[PDB]
Design a protein around this ligand. Structure first.
Ligand code: TQC
Ligand code: ZN
Length: 140
């Protein structure tokens, strides 16, 4: 679990969205595993606007932050997970590192702020849902 809190937006894994997130829906995309909902209190997070391929992500299943190199956001085939089938996911960035299903929502951050959240795992890779293309998170 985990979320990005930017302005009055809450960014979560679409597969972990609550009834409240769906009841207060701003934007969702099953092919990115991303859902954004509206918040009452404003958020502490800034969004990276950058093409950085180095950063640090939180791994809840290790209680650790790991510096990683990661691929640019792409359309990637992902093997079946306990929360999704074997399928293509878009705007996905891969690095070498530990990602279990409960790691989804852990933040990946660079020198420019929040890059994305853990979305995929297994075979010693960790996939992140990029949010740096979502410029609209930075206003309204
Ligand atoms: C409707 N739509 C479709 C694709 N992207 C959007 C979207 N992005 O931001 C928003 C507005 C910004 C304030 C909430 N909608
Ligand atoms: Zn950056």
């Amino acid at each position: 679990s985990g979320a990005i809190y930017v302005g009055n937006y809450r960014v979560v894994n679409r597969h972990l969205a609550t009834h409240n997130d769906w009841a207060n829906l701003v934007w969702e995309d099953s092919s990115r595993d991303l859902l954004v909902s509206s918040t009452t209190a404003q958020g502490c997070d800034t969004i990276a606007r950058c093409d950085c391929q180095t950063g640090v992500y939180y791994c809840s299943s290790r209680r650790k932050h790991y510096p990683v190199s990661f691929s640019k956001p792409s359309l990637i085939f992902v093997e079946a997970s306990e929360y999704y089938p074997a399928r293509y996911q878009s705007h996905l960035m891969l690095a070498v590192g530990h990602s279990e299903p409960g790691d989804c929502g852990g933040i990946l951050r660079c020198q420019h702020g929040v890059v994305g959240i853990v979305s995929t795992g297994g075979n010693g890779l960790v996939g992140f849902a990029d949010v740096r293309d979502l410029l609209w998170l930075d206003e309204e």
